[PDB]
């Protein structure tokens, strides 16, 4: 009874330490990546990344609201206000 529990625990700890050592060897084995295209040119296409997908960063231009678009609830000057104001414009 006690011997079975102790033997099971010894086998369990030994297996777990074995998998941990195998993981450590695998991290020691796995290859690394080296840079093609330099540091001074990855930032350039990152700069172009932030100017054709997300232009709002690095802009703060605050463009005006276009004239083909209906106003928020109401400030003055049937259907709902969205559709009615689309008909009005």
């Amino acid at each position: 009874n006690m011997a079975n529990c102790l033997k099971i625990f010894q086998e369990n700890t030994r297996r777990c330490k074995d998998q941990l050592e195998e993981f450590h060897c695998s991290v020691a084995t796995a290859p690394k990546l080296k840079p093609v295209r330099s540091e001074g040119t990855v930032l350039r296409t990152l700069h172009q990344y932030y100017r054709q997908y997300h232009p709002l960063s690095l802009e703060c231009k605050n463009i005006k609201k276009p004239l083909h678009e209906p106003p928020i609830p109401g400030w003055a000057g049937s259907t709902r206000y969205t559709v009615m104001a689309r008909n009005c414009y």
Partner: peptide, 30 residues
Amino acid sequence: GTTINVWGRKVLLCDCDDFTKTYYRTKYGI
């Protein structure tokens, strides 16, 4: 495709977003 060691766990990298794809495409040609 690699598995990393977050303090002993067997976690596996599966996907990335498009910014990470662009960064690896430029920096490492992947």
